[PDB]
Point group: D2
Chain length 349, copies 4
């Protein structure tokens, strides 16, 4: 008869079930996510890193290059798209989404509207996007998108008490509100509280901060009634700071990352999809491999890489359309490299 | 360095301006005029006076309100919808200048309305944080010196409403809004309206309002909001609309003052009450009852719209003929509530029947 | 000092963290669980009256000797929770009771809470006492041989009165968190026990909702107080319908909704969950624990911390008699093994599987 | 007609009313509280500075000296006692509490059981005493006690992040629990979250930490259902740290203290009763005066002083039965000095 009222109420069976199946498919054994959700601005920085200007024709051709790759769906379960790309066609008539449906890859969509400063903090970041989010999700689901992405940024600066409480909770609560809005509108939310590697902090300090942040994130999720079974976490790997602290090894990066997750992420969460940050394409693969070499986990420990999958793909494409067959060969190589890291079976040489 | 885990302070310059504006907004004997009705909301008002909801009529009506000579004596500020803040009257003069001429501070509604919180039974979240900082910069240039953001909570005891999710979404939303405002030089009116809907007793409303406000002010300190440059716009503590045990104004006054004294710190310059579904007389009589209870640690004044405008429209009918007669009615109500600020409004129980002898 | 992140709990010394973790692992060993023998003088007097026997120090010592003196009991039991008296007690022939456990390889534990009191401004909701002098008692209990502790808190589900209230949930959450961090500092693995009572007519789904909310809150308090999950254990109620509800709930639901709730709230750094049998029968406690483990392999050990569910029938077949000791120790081993098999999801002894079934006509 | 369930329930009208009257009396106009709640542990040290043996006879004689002062009730509304003193009689057969009743002073009782380390913090302190507290209160009320005191300690060290969140909440939640138990058992709780002045931090930093701590303390109080009308706060004044050697004049001590309270303490709280910390007898009076010279406040801003009232009373006594009269004059002098500080009218200026 009477429910315990002071508790978030359940997702209707139908959507809860769909969210859970999408989430499981997204972390299928041997697969991960391709981050191709670069906005017009963030594409202009990478395109013009290898020359040839940032037009709608070049962007469409580049996303065609990525999503048109045969066999990529064996290593990639989902592709995070920017709004433009989601409704876009190739120079050939076909929806970009259909080429993901061809290769049997799930389309996703970035839904955050970027970062703004939290007042009364030293430039700590709040993520925008809740305004009209529900309505955008309905439109994105119709367009084919089955999962979402929302990025928030925290900073480790121990001297200045960063990340601060205000920063941690603005981030935690923002993600929780986003994630519940997606699930209501039939999209699996990728919850991304990226702690930046910037600074000279040790790996132990990063472990402490990441644990504190994640504990607080999951608390907000529960608060807001988010179904963990139909959600994914996209955290930073636990590493020493860029400015260094006895330049640690992959053995450590793997242990302190697995430990942190085991103390903070409940097993109802189907999987964690790691973000590469500033790591090299190779170290992103070596570190993911070190994480999975530490035995079979309660969740799928896989990847959501952008730069780590695309860097040498761009630099071996250079715009010219003769390289598409050749550029996709570099993509597949990296996709398989990270697929093997999922299994803990990626060595090197 | 200093203690790092606490919000940083506002610059001495803006903190001082916010504090001055907040004080002026709750000046002795003054309150705020809520003329912030959107196009959709003001359309429903013009139906009652069978008038076309056009840009011409809206401009003429706001001209009617802000063009009133002597309105500034009783009104310190006017909340506006975006359109009106940039709008002109039919004779070319910008309506913000009409407020300036009567020395009334212009304000601006910045929330983008309500949406459902998922996993709650239709409990409401207020939208508007996206691009808010930018809108504030634009509104300050336009002349606006304070803002308004409305959130709605509901009391339904059997259904555990307001639920915790509801209270904190509201609390945190208002805290973020207030902090973004103050950064951009606007005094935020923090409005956590608990609806009077339902049959709940006045004691239950007191319990809920106290819990909500305790939670709101926590979010406020959390986000680093300067209480000295902010204002609270709460519901008066009242029994619900369908409560058989019908209460009188003296209780509305007591349980409202109590609730505020247990939750609102005195750094807050003043509370500007919302009318709710109260009639014009009730809104004045109840505000008067609140202030009849001694002098308070903060200014207990009003932010009324319907309670100031209801009869003004009904003695106008859109006709330029009856403008003079509508101003009459606005100044009457404005003065009535100005007197209730002091606790000296009668406006029509010993009342002894005497006789004889010495 | 060095510029590390300062607004978080500081780590335990490497030495004690490691000991706590090994004890916690041993406490949830394969095929093992915990024996709750921590009955107070007042509570043990109630059970001795059901066998028409007197409650003296001699009888209590004899009964605990009966339990801990059982040969081979350590194959099914990893640890035994004791009441302070028993921890510092010798048997008939002057042998310390803790030594009886050492022989049988069982780890001794100790109840450290000082009972329940009402939270003011709630409708008789309960707060657990005991933080005063706790650190000191732990030092004394560790010297006495105790390697883990137990602290019980009680929440009630009454949906109409909004129980458990937020005040109740946090007093319990914070109390347990404080208790945990005091124990771990003093080298004792804390069993964190937020028992949600089965009392009332609530459905299983409502219990799942409340258990999930409570555990989410408990683990938040743990993390804030700096408790090492690797060196701690959780002792929750199984998720079940209220006692006064309808007249059913199938054990497969008790199993599903219990496993689900834990998967959404308990992070895998926690070595194991040790369930309390509450008001279940001895057989039901075994059948339900079996249903939980029949649901594939789990990220933690899902085992038992049973008292009544292990002792009810032993007390019965004993009645204070020196002769029945031999015979009663068989009933103990029977139940201990029954639950050991339930740990593996491999218990039957009464029915088997609630499926298939019938009369096969063969051809 | 059901009430809103997820909120702490009210105290019975009877006890709520009594708590509120006691709280009001405790911060009467021109009055404050005498902290005579020293343990045997701590009064030993004060007796050592006056070369006196710490015996039951001497302790009883000293408390007789304090509470036996004629016309002390004019300047003091309440006296916080140590358990021993509450049940003790003078070398004469007269109950100590009867001496308080004679001057119409309200007896109070210290109920905390001292401090212990919070594990996983750098020696930050948690206050003990919740075990059996309800029962002790019933006993203390029967003995005549009408209000209680519970001391918690936070430290400001900005480099080490103190007070850390764990420390702030353990303190806040402990005080809330203590407060709620007292009120249930008819005792007005003095909520004391002392932020120590130790360190070289500036007055602004102290204001920032005190504000944060008090915001969190009052949050716990609402959570636990504490009736603010029947409670008192005993905070540190906002001051610079002991080191640094900045100015930190009394006008600033007054301003930043008043500001902090106005941003954190709701007016339902009848009054704030300041602790002196390690301030000198005069400094404690001058600073309290500077606070009240900043105009009439929404609550009574008064004192709960021990050392700052007793230091010279003790030293000008030396344990000697002759010096009783003489020391009592020093006490009244100080009591009146701080009573005048209440009104903002102590030593009619210096600027």
């Amino acid at each position: 008869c009477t429910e315990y009222m002071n508790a978030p109420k359940k997702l209707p069976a139908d959507v809860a079930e769909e969210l859970a199946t999408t989430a499981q498919k997204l972390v299928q054994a041997g697969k991960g996510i391709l981050a191709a959700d670069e906005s017009t601005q963030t594409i202009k920085k990478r395109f013009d890193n290898i020359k040839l200007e940032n037009t709608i024709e070049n962007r469409a051709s580049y996303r065609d290059l990525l999503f048109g790759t045969k066999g990529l769906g064996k290593f990639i379960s989902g592709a995070i798209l920017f709004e433009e790309t989601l409704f876009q066609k190739n120079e050939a008539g076909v929806p970009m989404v259909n080429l993901l449906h061809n290769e049997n890859i799930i389309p996703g969509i970035k839904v955050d509207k970027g970062l703004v400063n939290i007042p009364c903090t030293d430039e700590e970041k709040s993520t925008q996007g809740l305004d009209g989010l529900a309505e955008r999700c309905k439109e994105y689901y119709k367009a084919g998108a089955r999962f979402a992405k929302w990025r928030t940024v925290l900073v480790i600066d121990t001297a200045k008490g960063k990340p601060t409480d205000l920063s941690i909770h603005e981030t935690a609560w923002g993600l929780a509100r986003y994630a519940s809005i997606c699930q209501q509108n039939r999209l699996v939310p990728i919850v991304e509280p990226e702690i930046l590697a910037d600074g000279p902090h040790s790996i132990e300090v990063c472990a402490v901060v990441t644990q504190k942040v994640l504990s607080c994130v999951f608390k907000a999720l529960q608060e807001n009634g988010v179904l963990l079974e139909g959600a994914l976490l996209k955290p930073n790997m636990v590493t020493a700071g860029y400015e260094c602290t006895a330049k640690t090894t992959t053995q450590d990066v793997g242990f302190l990352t697995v430990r942190t997750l085991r103390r903070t992420v409940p097993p109802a969460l189907p999987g964690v999809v790691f973000l590469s940050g500033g790591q090299s394409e190779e170290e992103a693969s070596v570190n993911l491999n070190s994480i999975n070499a530490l035995g079979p986990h309660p969740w799928a420990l896989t990847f959501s890489y952008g730069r780590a999958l695309q860097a040498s793909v761009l630099n071996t494409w250079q715009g010219k359309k003769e390289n598409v067959a050749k550029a996709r060969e570099v993509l597949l190589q990296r996709a398989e490299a990270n697929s093997l890291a999922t299994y803990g079976k990626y060595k090197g040489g």
